[PDB]
Amino acid sequence: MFPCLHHSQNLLRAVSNMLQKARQTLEFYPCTSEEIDHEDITKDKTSTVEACLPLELTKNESCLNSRETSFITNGSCLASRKTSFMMALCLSSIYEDLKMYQVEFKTMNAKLLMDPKRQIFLDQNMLAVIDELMQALNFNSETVPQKSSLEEPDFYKTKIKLCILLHAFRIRAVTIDRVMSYLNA
Amino acid sequence: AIWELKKDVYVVELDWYPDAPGEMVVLTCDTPEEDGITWTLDQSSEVLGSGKTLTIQVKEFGDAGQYTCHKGGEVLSHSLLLLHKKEDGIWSTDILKDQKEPKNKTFLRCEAKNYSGRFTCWWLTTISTDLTFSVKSSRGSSDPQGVTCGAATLSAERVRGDNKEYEYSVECQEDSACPAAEESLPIEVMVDAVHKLKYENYTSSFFIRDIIKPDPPKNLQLKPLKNSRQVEVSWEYPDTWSTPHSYFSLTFCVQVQGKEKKDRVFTDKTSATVICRKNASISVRAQDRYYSSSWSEWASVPC
Amino acid sequence: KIDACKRGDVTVKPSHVILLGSTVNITCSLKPRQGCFHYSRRNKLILYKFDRRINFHHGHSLNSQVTGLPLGTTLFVCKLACINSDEIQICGAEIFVGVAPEQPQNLSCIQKGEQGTVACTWERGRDTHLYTEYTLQLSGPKNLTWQKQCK
Ligand SMILES: *[C@@H]1O[C@H](CO)[C@@H](O[C@@H]2O[C@H](CO)[C@@H](O[C@@H]3O[C@H](CO)[C@@H](O)[C@H](O)[C@@H]3O)[C@H](O)[C@H]2NC(C)=O)[C@H](O)[C@H]1NC(C)=O
Numbered sequence: 001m002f003p004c005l006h007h008s009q010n011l012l013r014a015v016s017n018m019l020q021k022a023r024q025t026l027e028f029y030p031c032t033s034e035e036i037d038h039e040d041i042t043k044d045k046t047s048t049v050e051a052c053l054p055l056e057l058t059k060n061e062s063c064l065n066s067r068e069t070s071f072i073t074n075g076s077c078l079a080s081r082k083t084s085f086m087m088a089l090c091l092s093s094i095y096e097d098l099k100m101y102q103v104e105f106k107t108m109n110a111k112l113l114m115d116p117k118r119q120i121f122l123d124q125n126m127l128a129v130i131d132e133l134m135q136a137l138n139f140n141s142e143t144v145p146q147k148s149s150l151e152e153p154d155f156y157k158t159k160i161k162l163c164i165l166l167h168a169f170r171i172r173a174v175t176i177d178r179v180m181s182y183l184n185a
Numbered sequence: 186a187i188w189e190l191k192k193d194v195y196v197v198e199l200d201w202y203p204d205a206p207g208e209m210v211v212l213t214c215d216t217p218e219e220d221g222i223t224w225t226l227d228q229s230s231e232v233l234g235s236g237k238t239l240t241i242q243v244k245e246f247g248d249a250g251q252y253t254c255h256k257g258g259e260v261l262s263h264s265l266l267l268l269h270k271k272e273d274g275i276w277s278t279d280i281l282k283d284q285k286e287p288k289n290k291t292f293l294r295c296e297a298k299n300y301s302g303r304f305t306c307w308w309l310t311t312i313s314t315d316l317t318f319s320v321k322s323s324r325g326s327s328d329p330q331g332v333t334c335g336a337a338t339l340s341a342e343r344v345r346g347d348n349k350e351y352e353y354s355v356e357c358q359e360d361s362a363c364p365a366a367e368e369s370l371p372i373e374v375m376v377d378a379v380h381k382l383k384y385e386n387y388t389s390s391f392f393i394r395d396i397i398k399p400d401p402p403k404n405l406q407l408k409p410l411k412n413s414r415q416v417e418v419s420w421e422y423p424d425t426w427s428t429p430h431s432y433f434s435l436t437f438c439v440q441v442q443g444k445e446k447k448d449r450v451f452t453d454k455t456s457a458t459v460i461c462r463k464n465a466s467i468s469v470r471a472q473d474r475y476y477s478s479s480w481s482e483w484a485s486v487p488c
Numbered sequence: 489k490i491d492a493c494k495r496g497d498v499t500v501k502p503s504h505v506i507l508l509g510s511t512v513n514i515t516c517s518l519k520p521r522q523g524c525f526h527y528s529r530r531n532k533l534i535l536y537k538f539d540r541r542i543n544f545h546h547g548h549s550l551n552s553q554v555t556g557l558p559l560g561t562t563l564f565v566c567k568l569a570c571i572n573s574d575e576i577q578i579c580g581a582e583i584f585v586g587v588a589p590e591q592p593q594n595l596s597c598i599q600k601g602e603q604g605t606v607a608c609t610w611e612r613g614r615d616t617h618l619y620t621e622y623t624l625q626l627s628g629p630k631n632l633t634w635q636k637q638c639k
Pocket residue numbers: 186187188189196198269375377386
């Protein structure tokens with residue numbers, strides 16, 4: 001049993017439940033996988049797409065581009081002398097992916113609360129799981145400050161952006177789960 | 186408009202309504218200049234036009250065919266003509282048939298069995314002869330020579346109704362050397378169906394994970410527990426499925442209904458224990474554990 | 489920057505928040521680069537309220553003036569229908585019709601026991617269909633006040 005793998009399995013399950021709630025709440029807003037384009041915020045910032053691979057799959061090492069964002073932050077999920085750099089860079093990039101998403105999700109939630117009705121709001125449990133996993137991934141975890149606005153934003157745009165992020169995040173959550181399973185075995 | 190599908194082949198786009206005027210079509214020959222070039226459409230020596238240039242509006246299919254560039258008694262060049270009918274401003278779709286299983290207007294159905302990127306696409310067409318297909322593929326549009334599609338082959342000749350639909354399939358492998366954990370661009374496959382003087386094209390966009398269909402579970406065996414009614418059943422991962430088996434995982438659903446309505450049990454473990462009625466079979470199915478995928482064929486061992 | 493609206497942008501006059509009784513000019517505009525791939529006089533630019541057709545213009549610029557909107561939120565979504573392809577949602581606007589907030593007629597503050605936390609209760613009045621922020625201020629003999637907001 002791997003504790004980070006348990007957190008990652010909790011993350012994928014939490015996103016799956018939130019995604020189901022989002023489809024039910026926003027009946028008109030189009031939130032089916034077919035009608036929602038895949039857009040990834042972390043497209044160029046992080047190297048999870050390349051660094052997070054089984055050791056057998058990655059060989060030439062040429063594609064790792066000049067140790068891109070090679071922070072290699074030390075953390076409680078692995079041990080400093082336990083695994084190869086290929087997994088050390090991957091764990092740092094996964095931490096960065098969760099930081100980029102959590103900062104955005106909190107911004108969306110703060111705008112959603114202002115709605116006169118409560119049609120939809122991001123799951124507090126899902127946000128807590130993202131923070132718990134980041135704390136294990138990197139010791140120098142930064143907790144996002146409470147975000148708020150002094151004005152009211154258009155709600156339709158936030159609800160379309162929300163659906164686009166949730167689906168992309170779910171794909172990211174499976175990718176983290178596969179890496180955690182590989183680390184355990 | 187007039188565009189060249191390939192050298193010596195020119196597809197002409199024509200509107201399809203009664204009493205329609207044809208587009209002015211100009212024929213040119215890339216040969217050393219000859220005074221007196223003659224032009225034929227049919228194999229017959231009826232001569233259509235003289236000069237290195239021939240003008241003929243393609244008002245109907247009869248006016249489309251292999252115009253021949255011949256002078257001096259030697260055929261200088263060749264000018265095959267292909268037609269892309271457009272009806273009410275909508276491109277014709279007659280060569281292939283609408284399966285409709287995913288949704289309406291679906292003529293291409295693709296599938297995969299591994300994360301390697303090897304995939305096969307099946308299209309059902311009811312035209313028995315004079316049929317040719319051109320297949321090209323790429324990841325998004327950025328990858329040049331991204332995918333190496335193979336050549337169409339007839340696969341089956343079933344008798345649905347009396348039409349006898351024939352199924353043609355292509356084998357395509359992602360030729361990208363760099364391994365990547367997640368796909369950001371959908372693979373796009375284009376089939377340029379050609380029949381006689383009629384040209385049609387079909388485009389399908391998809392992701393490998395969505396089209397993946399696992400092969401049936403391997404080495405299924407039943408081992409009765411000593412002095413107990415229940416029987417332990419053990420199965421193994423398919424060799425064809427991508428490795429390592431830790432990063433890529435499958436979920437096994439076991440149904441014991443054989444021949445009470447639903448004995449299906451979903452077990453991640455490779456061995457599950459089920460009471461075995463003497464008069465039934467035990468069957469196992471495989472699906473991608475991580476994402477929703479097409480279910481595998483049932484693997485049945487007599488019990 | 490994830491963008492919810494790419495094919496086109498929709499504007500509302502004066503604003504998404506309007507007084508009960510006012511009329512909004514929802515105008516759906518399509519960027520020139522985006523549009524129906526094949527020009528045809530069959531494709532339309534529909535505008536729907538709760539998926540109900542209110543207008544349709546072949547041209548990229550569509551203008552509408554909805555009136556008598558009731559209290560609440562109405563989702564006006566402006567989809568593009570091409571000749572054979574299915575409708576693609578382009579952009580939409582959510583309008584919250586609201587009214588001026590009710591004043592609290594009665595305010596009572598009660599402290600439970602000699603040692604207690606002061607609690608003040610008010611009659612909100614009619615619910616305005618809008619986000620409501622309540623501020624309670626307590627001032628003593630001279631002017632020194634405690635500020636608390638019930639968001
Ligand atoms: C699928 O079939 C359609 C039907 O012809 C193809 O659209 C046509 O594509 C050709 C090739 O680009 C166009 O001809 C040439 O286009 C270029 C670029 O615009 C231009 O420089 C040439 O002068 C000539 O126009 C043709 O205009 C176009 N037809 C229409 C109505 O747009 C399409 O390419 C086919 N796709 C595949 C993958 O085969």
